[PDB]
Design a binder for these strands. Sequence first.
RNA 1: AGCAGUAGCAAGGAG
RNA 2: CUCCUGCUUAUG
Lengths: 688, 696, 295
Amino acid sequence: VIREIAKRFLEQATINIAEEVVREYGDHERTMISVGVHFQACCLISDEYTLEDETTPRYVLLEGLKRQEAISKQNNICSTLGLEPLRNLADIFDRKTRRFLEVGITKRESDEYYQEKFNKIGNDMDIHVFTYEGKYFSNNPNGLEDIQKTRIFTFLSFVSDELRKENMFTEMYVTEEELEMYKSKLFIAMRDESVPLPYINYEHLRTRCETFKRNQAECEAKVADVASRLKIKLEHLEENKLRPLEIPKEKEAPYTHKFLMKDAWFFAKPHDSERAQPQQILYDFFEAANMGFMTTSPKPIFGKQGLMYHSLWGQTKRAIKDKRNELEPSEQRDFLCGIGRASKKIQEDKWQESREEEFKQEETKGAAKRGFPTWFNEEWLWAMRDSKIGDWIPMAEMPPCKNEMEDYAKKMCEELESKIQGTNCAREMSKLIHTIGSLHTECRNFPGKVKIVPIYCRGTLRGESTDCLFGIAIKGKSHLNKDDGMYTVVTFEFSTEEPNPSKHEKYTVFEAGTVPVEAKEKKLFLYCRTTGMSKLKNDWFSKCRRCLIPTMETVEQIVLKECALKEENRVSEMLENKRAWIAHENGENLTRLVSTKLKDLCRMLIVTQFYYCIYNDNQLEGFCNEQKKFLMFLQADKDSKSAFTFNQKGLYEKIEECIVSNPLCIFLADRLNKLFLVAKSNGAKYFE
Amino acid sequence: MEINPYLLMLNNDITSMISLTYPYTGAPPMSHGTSTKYSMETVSRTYSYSRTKKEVPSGIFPIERRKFCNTIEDKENLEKPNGNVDINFMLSLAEMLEEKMGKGFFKFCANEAEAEILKMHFSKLTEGRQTYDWTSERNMPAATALQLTVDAIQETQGTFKGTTMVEYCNKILEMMDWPEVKFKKVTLMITKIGREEFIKRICTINTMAKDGERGKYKRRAIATPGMGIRPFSKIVETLAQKICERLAESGLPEKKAKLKTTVSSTNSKLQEGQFMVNITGDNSKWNECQQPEAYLAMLAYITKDSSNLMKDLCSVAPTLFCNKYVKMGQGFRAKNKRKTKEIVIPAKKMKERKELMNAEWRDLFETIEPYMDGECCFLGGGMLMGMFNMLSTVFGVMTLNYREERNCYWTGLQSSDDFVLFCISRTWPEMEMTILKFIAVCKLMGINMSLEKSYGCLPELFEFTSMFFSGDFVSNIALELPAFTTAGMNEGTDFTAAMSVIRTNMINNGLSPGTALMALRICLQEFRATYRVHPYDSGVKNHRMKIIRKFIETIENKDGLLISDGGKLMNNISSLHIPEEILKEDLMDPSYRNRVFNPRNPFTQFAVVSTHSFRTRSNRTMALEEKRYQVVCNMYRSVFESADVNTPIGSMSMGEAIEAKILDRARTQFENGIIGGEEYSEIKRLIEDAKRQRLS
Amino acid sequence: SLLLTLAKEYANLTKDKKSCKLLSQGTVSSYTTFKKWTTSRKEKNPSLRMRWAMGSKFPIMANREILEEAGIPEQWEGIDLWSKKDLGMVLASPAAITYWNFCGPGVDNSSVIKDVYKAKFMKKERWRETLWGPMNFELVGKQRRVVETQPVEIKLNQKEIKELTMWVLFEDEANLASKFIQENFSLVLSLRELYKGKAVNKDVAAFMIAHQFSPEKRFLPTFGPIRPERMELLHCLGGDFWKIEAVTAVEGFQVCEYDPRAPLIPRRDLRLIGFGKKVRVFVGQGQEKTLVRTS
RNA sequence: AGCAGUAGCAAGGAG
RNA sequence: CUCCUGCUUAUG
């Protein structure tokens, strides 16, 4: 700010006088500060010792003054003595030296300014030039020994320090000795060419833009735009065409999660503090979970490749039997985890041309389309059903509370924490954290070496801290340079349920043996699946503990809105005596809902935030934008505000464009359609 | 029993049930391969939205030029987006804009902008995002790009004595007048380049793919410019920044109170039969329908009475946007029928290797060919991301302050690409007339409202910058989860920085208290999992808890330990502004307090409490210039012991005050101090020999 | 060093021609970009890289001579804590950090830490001696304000704060002695009797003086009274749907010119070789004149 | 094979 | 299709 710093170093009132001088000078910006400094320069020259005997002052100030009275006061001082001008208006007249008094203040070494002034006037005036640097380089008549020189060098070192504060070097320029851009040769032909079409040069465009006044033929072009429009708004009270979405009627989508949730079977043992690394847990479960009874037939039940999974499972079985997790190179691991399977990246240096031999080109296809899954409801209802193993997620402790709202937040953390630690979703989060954590540290510490990493958990059983074992995982020699890279993990899973060629489409299910189950001794199946994680996907799945933040944010928004509108501390009974409508039945939907308690609601919220943490693709993102749009339409239905839309054709083209094969997206689209069916029972903006 | 979560919306609002529909817990989408087809769709779509054929050939550049203003060929489907601007219409909107508030509006705002350009140092150009350095033709941070640009100035002809914005810009135009520029390549061979390649290189803007963008199925390309376009864009963003701060219907710098004042104010100006309908609108293709020729027309009108310097200095960056080049990424690939051998064709050989492309690639390539360079593309009407954002909002204020003359009108609020319009009228066919007049003024000026993503109601039920406003209640911005734990520096700056992020999201956003305690406990848990430290009562036995479990009887007061050293949590929601050490130093043992806080430690030697600050080892996979420059940094920091705090003033010389400083403190420490001839005469001989060696 | 070898390394490391093209013939401005120049581009995932670093065996670059002066190579059961690889800087484990934290030497530095961080210990004392009460559970809301949030008693404006520390610790290259500085020069006269003899580093001194005096102005949503003591606890006292509060309570010298052959006597002897002499003064960054005392 | 979606990874060199 | 190559000891 010019005015703020100019009121810092320069005086208070002198700003207004110098600004008046600029108001009498012209369209000039920087010179204010210079003239202001110059005025205080004269204030430091002609204030205290101005020839007090004969009080009519030695320094006749007729430079910084109103441009009316310099001729009159000049004709009132010089009417007694009488002098001669020196081709320029004098700054300050004098009668003790009987000469003029010139004042100039400069930045540089004062030689060139004084020689150009020597070209203008010579030294026939009384020249006074003061430098910011500290050079009294002026005419031979001088001040005697006064503090006018000392205070003016203090003042110019002062103001020059202010110039060195805020980078003011190209700002103290006198106009005769800043407002000119460097008029080059090729830019002046560049700006003249980039004008609009009815213009010739930038000069004509600049004068026409300086000489523009508006007209009332604007509305002629505006109404002329309204006439060729052919656009009408589309209401909802008469044309409620909110039709259900086109879920594709094709083959059912397969089970595409990296691990198993509901078809899993595990072996438990008491956990020891010393044996804690995943290789030692793998060895202790090699003595615990008996691989001696793990006989696999060479014929799979279904699938594609059976011999390589048999030789690979036997190879890792005797590999763990020798207590070292590094598979020796054979054809099985050279076939499963890809070694030598990549395209030869050849640059454009030689091409070895040939007459229609290796004719190369490019091709892209897209993504394959699937249909609505039916296996997702039982995994949802299992995913919020209690398992007796207790705490699964390793949550930290509670800080000590004051007499503040920390009893409220402690109550909410202890109740919601006490409800989510027992569900199966916490078991799956523990599975992803421990398994993908160990696989991630193996992807750092040993590239190029195939490891054998178990798939396990750790939970409290009958008070005693136990651990489990779900599967056997095989790393695929990750060389992770960038965020992608897609290393291949081979997964051998343990299952206690019979397979399904409709759901388990990506497996090669074998038969393993028998398991005793207490309540006779049921079967045991082994699953096989090749898959691939990624480096960014290891950080986003290895940190899947942070799903409690939107869940508890949603529950706490409900409770704080409720006690925000009831104006009374009703929390501990509101968390018990408040219903939430979920889970309409299969045969009927018309106003047949299930009101549940709020604890099952936060169970379902941690379920849907976990399934949001798994299945994040492009399609879920764009579908979540469009379902926020239809949620705004349903809020427009809840108050009968008579909303409207301009084009309802391309909207469903964009929604039906972004639903291809993601099972969570198809499921939320179908349940959104059933939400429109329930909303059709009360409000009228929808179809059947 | 079937199950449905969205039934929660049957008896609540949407202010509480909207974080349920944000998937901000999973992985963000990434791009793959090349970013060529995206840029070709942007440029070919930009020429396909120009609605013209009238070409003017160029004598400077060897490529053709297609005009964009006042050359319209009115197709029947006007709802398809157009890229044509009527300059008389928008200048009429400028006079209609400034006649509402004041008379000397552009003169006062242009004097406020003119006051704060001359007092700007050019190191402000280095406080930006990643730019495109043209020395090696790569993407570098701005300090290295200005380093190589200033090194090119001092390497080609003369030295640099600017230290301002204006003399640096005039130095760039002086480089545009130079016939041959010599810079450094590869081990530093100094090569030369002519005149036309310098103009083809100074107008080069690199396009890559936007990574980590939540909300699109199809990817969108982002573009970063060079360095020789940036400071003029800083000038235009300061001018339009002061214009947008002076206005009253813009929200670029409170975004909540202004909508309360326009709803409460414009509902208080109704008749006995008129009413209000608000429409949420979202402009599509906003980066392809804002031509810089309209910025050249308006910025010749804002600066009609400003100066002679600013009148010429605010009409330079729109020209460089009027002849800008667009990079092509890095090409494509080709493979045989066996899908084993795959050659890589770069963007250079795309002209010769046209016969190896798909149907979509040849559809986007045959309609883009006569505007192509040998390595780049030509664009003269686009305005991509990473460009003027504070100036199109001025156009948005211009369209929302239109006077058509009953007594029916509109108002609202504008953002980067979100606008909320409040219509006041009498009947529904007159609502069709006023909304179609808003589509008329936006369609004539060059703002294409999307018809698929726009709606409205009678009361406030609108969308603006992802904050859904209901009739009475107000939703917040959905918070980014991964910003909680991205400190990764120290055992001391991972937890206190996490409490600072929880603090600023508690003050800025809503962030209800139990959610904040839960997030603090989760970040505590990942802190304990990262540095492998657990409490003493747990039976964890790893390579650090053996020493802590072994020596637990030496510590008398058990809560005086630290979290990173084997203690439990004592920070709370009411203790986020206080770190753990300052909360716990009143309960430590004196052997522990004297033991941990030793500055004679093998880890710190070689803005929180520094007692665990270790440096991890660097990686194993331009290195002389950092050696010499950091020798200058350690030297000048070693001479002036307090110089990283204050700005280093004084530009006559560095080493003269260095030599007079070693004489100053050698004489200062000498004369009532050392007193010995060989040390003072020895340092005198070294300084004199260094001066005679340097100055010659 | 002790300022005896700085001229030798100044002599030997200014033997280059391009360093002479930079220094005193090039860009003094680019030192402001020399301080922030390094090739560390973005570090897009620093905590992931720290998890990979702590997953190795010896990630830490630690000093050698102190821990070989005091520490032990291997602990009581096989915990490796050392390396023999390389300059003279030895890799190590965080078990050596906790071993230093439990079996290390002790140095009395209570007054040092309890004098550097006085603002935050004052925040601990002002947080310890407050009292809360019941809640409200009612609607609340107010616009955003620009509030200075710290109980300071000087209240400078972020421009005299750099200039104070520069005009306390090293007054030579500092800044102007301005017109808003005469009362601040009485503050310098009161503060030169404090920060003269200390064992504190000068950047830490600029940290504690730059923090114990500055009212930090922010743009925050406030409500109720805007007293500056209850504004740093803004995050705890109220939210959006709830509210809780129950708080009841000497160089007076001058210079003249540049010409005379002054005696080479700097500011260290500016008082005894003061009056009646044209004694030269070297002002900091290069502005050195010859001095005459003015009454 | 597989990950993945509008194009890349699934080691590198020589024949 | 054929032929030749490598260290990083991982603990809720």
